[PDB]
Amino acid sequence: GPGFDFAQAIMKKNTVIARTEKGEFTMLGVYDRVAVIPTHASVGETIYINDVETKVLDACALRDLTDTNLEITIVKLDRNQKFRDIRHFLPRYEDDYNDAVLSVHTSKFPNMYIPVGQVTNYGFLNLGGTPTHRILMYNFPTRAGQAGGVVTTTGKVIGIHVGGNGAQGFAAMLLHSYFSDTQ
């Protein structure tokens, strides 16, 4: 179906397996050598990208106007391969959505596709003790190891998975404005 075709294409061309000291994460490549990863991955000065030691040229843990964690870290990678530019698939504002898919790919969870259904946005989530803003919630019982998983709808890349409470899953919202690249 159309949703799954889109999630599969995003997985096909715009993800890598990232590995920090904290373990494996699904990593979404956004454009050029810029990718995102949940902030609790604790990205260092180097990171394994599909098992290749890759220097980190920059790592920026995003925080909003309120100096509040957004749980996305934007990473610039020292590698020759260039990500296809999917910034046009990113929402421009916070929204709700229907029929979302959570797509994960790691060694532990290879090629995982979960139709999580309706997604609702919130301004708030206390994430393992850290206040966090701009969160998408889906009523599905996600599990540790899916962090960084990409959430999509037909034609939109809307968030990356950051955590869960046993019954619900939470994603950090992706906004086009994050990747404005205006110094």
In 39-96, the DSSP E strands lie at 46-49, 52-63, 69-77
Give bridge partners of residue 136 from the DSSP assignment: 121, 171
Closest CA to 47 of 69, 162, 143, 36: 36
For residues 123 and 104, the answer to whether their CB atoms sit within 8 Å is no
At 35, the amino acid letter reads A
Closest CA to 149 of 27, 9, 62, 21: 27
| DSSP notation for 101-152 | EEEE-SSSSTTEEEEEEEEEEES-EEETTEEE-SEEEESS---TT-TT-EEE
How far is the C-alpha of 143 from the C-alpha of 120, rounded, in Å? Answer: 19
Longest pairwise C-alpha distance within the chain: 41
16, containing H or E segment:
strand 15-20
For residues 66 and 47, the answer to whether their CB atoms sit within 8 Å is no
Q: Which domains does the chain have, with CATH numbers?
A: 2-10+87-179 (2.40.10.10), 15-77 (2.40.10.10)
For residues 128 and 163, the answer to whether their CB atoms sit within 8 Å is yes
Query: How far lies 83's CA from each of 29, 64, 121, in Å?
Result: 6, 26, 28
3-state secondary structure string, 161-174?
EEEECCCCEEEEEC
Q: How was this structure determined?
A: X-ray
How far is the C-alpha of 32 from the C-alpha of 40, rounded, in Å? Answer: 23
At 126, the amino acid letter reads N
Q: Sign of torsion, CA 122 16 166 101?
A: positive
